[PDB]
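Lab notes, practical 5.
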Amino acid sequence: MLFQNVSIAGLAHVDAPHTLTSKEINGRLQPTYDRLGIKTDVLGDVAGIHARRLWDQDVQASDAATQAARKALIDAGIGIEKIGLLVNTSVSRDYLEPSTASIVSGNLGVGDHCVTFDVANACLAFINGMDIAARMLERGEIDYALVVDGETANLVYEKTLERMTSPDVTEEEFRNELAALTLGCGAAAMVMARTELVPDAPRYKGGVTRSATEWNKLCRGNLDRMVTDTRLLLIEGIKLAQKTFLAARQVLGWAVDELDQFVIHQVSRPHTAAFVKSFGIDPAKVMTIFGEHGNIGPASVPIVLSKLKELGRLKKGDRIALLGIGSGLNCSMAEVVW
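Output from the prediction step:
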């Protein structure tokens, strides 16, 4: 059941404007590192993150999704009146109600037939949103869909860092906060379309998903508290991808000589290194922005895809694997043929 008539008509990303160096952060962490007896630069020497970006101070996730969406429409050569679905896939959301998709829609000026809603699924939701749009397109219900994703980590830095002023932070608690200090701001959007409307545009085949929801307790995250079992996340994350790669061999025909680029959600330099080594992947076919942008959640995959496009690194016929292991645990692997 792969998709037959779904293409990618437009794709864009926004880099958030302010650079926050890990150096600056480390100056605020220093007293806590000292009190805990730790001398390792965990951000820069172990996670491999030297910088991440931040939005202006009162920017909303919907503002960033909206900008990306306007650039993707330009890329696609169409106006908003053609869009019949807009799905927001972000972890960052403006409010409980209405949906972030509603706000982005209203900002852009969609017409009264456009269907909107948010989807949420940790760092895989952008792929989920693609698949949801692809089924509507494949069926003929609509001609073009937007999938949008703006992520803001500003508040995470403000709260997380302000917790450091505290004599009270334990090592277990600090170790979770360091993980929050790998997150970054950014946004992306993609216009998907029925293939016949955009001949020669990249084609979206769809993909495969496996899950291990028995492991849903391995992490828990709010703005107030993040708890994780990073040992088992790694161990069970990798077993889940093994299983999911086997599904993609069977359904997509994936094999290492067949894949031109891997566009992978990333959590840290050493995690991505372990993954690449465990699967015999050529690190040159794995673009990374983690060093300068951190982890932008579910936006990471389309931002990397968009950066490959804009560098001219994608050629007609290139087989591109989109993939991620998200908390849940879930793993999705999908293919684009450029």
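Observations recorded by the TA: The chain has two domains: 1-198, 199-338. The longest strand covers residues 6-15.
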